[PDB]
């Protein structure tokens, strides 16, 4: 992690950190350059479905 | 799909048109729009028709063309886009309108979107622009209750 | 669980092909181990047979 802004999502992928999931109200205002998803993400809020 | 009819239009080659006189039944043709300026009147697309009602009535439309040519045939029609439920019934005398536009091999249904949208050459409404193609033995079917910008040619 | 697929018939009159002027338009899913497929219809259904 030294040379390139890395940002860890545990419980949280991108999409639910963007729209404000109960557990991603840590990434707030965050920038990166390289996100990484879990294989462990989940959802805890109101279903949905990006088209 | 923009991207799409450029390419078509552009692999084409030729802006060659056609004009076929389809059979429209009670409606008013040639609609003109303040936008639209030609010399010092106000005028629309030339090879686009715009159909609003007469007298309050605008019948439903069944019109078709059969292909008895040795080429294929594009046409291109258009749907309004009304910005209030007052403009759909000034200007085609129903609340909602339905667009079938259909061959042997392909069918096309559209339904209008009354919204307000931002006024471009003072103008809340939109039109959207289909195109259809049409082969050798093949027959262009078209049948709209409203909200329909016909073709002129092909 | 996972997606949603709404459908609308379309009403109109189409160039007739063995003397109908009617269509079908087909659609397909795919269920995953766990899941369940639901299927909630007031009109215009071509119900599938098996899987
Ligand atoms: C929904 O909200 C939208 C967005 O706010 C709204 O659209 C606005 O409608 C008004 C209606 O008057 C538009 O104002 C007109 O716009 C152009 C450009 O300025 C001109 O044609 C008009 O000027 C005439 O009228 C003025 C007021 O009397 C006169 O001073 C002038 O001399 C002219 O006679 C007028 O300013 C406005 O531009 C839009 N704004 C947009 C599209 O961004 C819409 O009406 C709202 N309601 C509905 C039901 O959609
Ligand atoms: C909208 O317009 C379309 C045409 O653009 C129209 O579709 C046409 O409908 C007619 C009438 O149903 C169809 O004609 C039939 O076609 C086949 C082949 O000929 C035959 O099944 C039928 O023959 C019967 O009728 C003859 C005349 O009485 C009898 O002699 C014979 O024994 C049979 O009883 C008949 O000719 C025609 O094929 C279509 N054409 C198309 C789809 O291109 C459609 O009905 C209109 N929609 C409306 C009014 O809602
Ligand atoms: C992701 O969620 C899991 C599951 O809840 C968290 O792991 C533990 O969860 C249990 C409840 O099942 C809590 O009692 C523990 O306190 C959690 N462990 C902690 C907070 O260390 C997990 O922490 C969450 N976060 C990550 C990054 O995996
Ligand atoms: C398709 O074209 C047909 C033929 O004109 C339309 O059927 C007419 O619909 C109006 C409005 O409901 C009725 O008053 C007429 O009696 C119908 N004519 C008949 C049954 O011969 C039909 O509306 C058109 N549009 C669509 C979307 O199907
Ligand atoms: C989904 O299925 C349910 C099964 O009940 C349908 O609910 C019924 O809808 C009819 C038609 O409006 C009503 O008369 C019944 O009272 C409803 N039953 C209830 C509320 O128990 C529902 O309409 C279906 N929806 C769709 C889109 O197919
Ligand atoms: C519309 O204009 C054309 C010529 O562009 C004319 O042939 C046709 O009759 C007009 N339709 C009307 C006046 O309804």
Redesign the interface.
Known sequence: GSPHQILDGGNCTLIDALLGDPQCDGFQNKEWDLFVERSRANSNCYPYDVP | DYASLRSLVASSGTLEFKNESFNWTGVKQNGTSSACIRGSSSSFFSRLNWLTSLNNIYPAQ?VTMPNKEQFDKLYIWGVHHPDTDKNQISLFAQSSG?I?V???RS?Q?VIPNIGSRPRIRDIPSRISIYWTIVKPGD?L?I?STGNLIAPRGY
């Open positions: 069944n339905r079938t259909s061959t042997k069918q249904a027959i079917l049948n």
